[PDB]
């Protein structure tokens, strides 16, 4: 279990609460979390989502938005996006590979 349940959809899905766009539209909380986003709104940033992997923030969503393409567009180099396979299907080999990058990204985020 530990501190990285965000590798798991269900946990990312949980992050969504008050997320407008409720069901049947390309931007359901399930499609979003599927793309790697978590929900972290604020006074001024109601619909602010962030990739648990890239840490890159993005705003301005609309019911008919495919979360993956916007993610793909504004963060072309997200390793999470390369794996055309759900985390559950990644070997522990690939998961440990992948998680080396994630942590490296985290630091590059405080690097600002
Ligand atoms: Zn990302
Ligand atoms: Zn955009």
Curated annotation (Swiss-Prot):
Subcellular location: Cytoplasm; Nucleus; Chromosome; Chromosome, Centromere
BIR repeat start-end pairs: 12-82
Post-translational modification: Ubiquitinated by the Cul9-RING ubiquitin-protein ligase complex, leading to its degradation. Ubiquitination is required for centrosomal targeting. Deubiquitinated by USP35 or USP38; leading to stabilization. The acetylated form represses STAT3 transactivation.
Positions of modified residues (N6-acetyllysine): 17, 84, 104, 106, 109
Cellular component GO terms, alphabetical: centriole; chromosome passenger complex; chromosome, centromeric region; cytoplasm; cytoplasmic microtubule; cytosol; interphase microtubule organizing center; kinetochore
Keywords recorded for this protein, A-Z: Acetylation, Apoptosis, Cell cycle, Cell division, Centromere, Chromosome, Chromosome partition, Cytoplasm, Cytoskeleton, Kinetochore, Metal-binding, Microtubule, Mitosis, Nucleus, Phosphoprotein, Protease inhibitor, Repressor, Thiol protease inhibitor, Transcription, Transcription regulation, Ubl conjugation, Zinc
Amino acids binding Zn(2+) 2: 70, 74
Function: Multitasking protein that has dual roles in promoting cell proliferation and preventing apoptosis. Component of a chromosome passage protein complex (CPC) which is essential for chromosome alignment and segregation during mitosis and cytokinesis. Acts as an important regulator of the localization of this complex; directs CPC movement to different locations from the inner centromere during prometaphase to midbody during cytokinesis and participates in the organization of the center spindle by associating with polymerized microtubules.
Domain note: The BIR repeat is necessary and sufficient for LAMTOR5 binding.
Record's protein name: Baculoviral IAP repeat-containing protein 5
Organism per entry: Mus musculus (Mouse)
Full-protein residues shown: 7 to 118 of 140
């Amino acid at each position: 279990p530990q501190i990285w349940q965000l590798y798991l959809k269900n946990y990312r899905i949980a992050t969504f609460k008050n997320w407008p766009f409720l069901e049947d539209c390309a931007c359901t909380p399930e499609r979003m979390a599927e793309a790697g986003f978590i929900h972290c709104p604020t006074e001024n940033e109601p619909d602010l989502a962030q990739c648990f992997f890239c840490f890159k923030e993005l705003e301005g969503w609309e019911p008919d938005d495919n979360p993956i393409e916007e993610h793909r567009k504004h963060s072309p180099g997200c390793a999470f996006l390369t794996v055309k396979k759900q985390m559950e299907e990644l070997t522990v080999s690939e998961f440990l590979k992948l998680d080396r990058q994630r942590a490296k990204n985290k630091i590059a985020k405080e690097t600002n």
